[PDB]
Structure 1
Amino acid sequence: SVKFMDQKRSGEETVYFKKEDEALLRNLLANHPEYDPKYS
């Protein structure tokens, strides 16, 4: 029950925030081109 809950929680959070990080990596360079090395 303990390792069960912990590992389920960790996997769910990992998947969710993996998706969110993918989306943010998609939409970063547009809204923050000052970091984009394309213009440097």
Structure 2
Amino acid sequence: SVKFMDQKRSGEETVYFKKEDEALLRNLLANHPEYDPKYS
């Protein structure tokens, strides 16, 4: 129950925020071109 809930929580959070980080990595360089080293 303890390791159960902990690992379930960790996996769910990991998946959710992996998706969110993928989306943010997709949409970063457009909205913040001053950081893109492609343009530097």
TM-score surpassing 0.5?
yes
Q: What RMSD, in angstroms, separates the aligned Cα atoms of the two structures?
A: 0.5
Q: How many residues align?
A: 40
Deviation beyond 6 Å, 4+ runs, structure 1 = none
Q: Which segments of 5 or more consecutive residues in structure 1 lack a partner in the other structure?
A: none
Q: CA deviation at 1:38?
A: 2.0
Q: Secondary structure at the match of 2:4?
A: helix
Q: Secondary structure at the match of 2:35?
A: coil
1:1-40 superposed Cα distances (whole Å, 9 cap, x missing partner): 0000000000000000000000000000000000111221
| Percent identity of paired positions between Structure 1 and Structure 2 | 100
TM-score (norm 1): 0.95
Q: Hey, what's the Cα distance between the residues in 1 that align with 2:38 and 2:14?
A: 31
Q: Which segments of 5 or more consecutive residues in structure 2 lack a partner in the other structure?
A: none
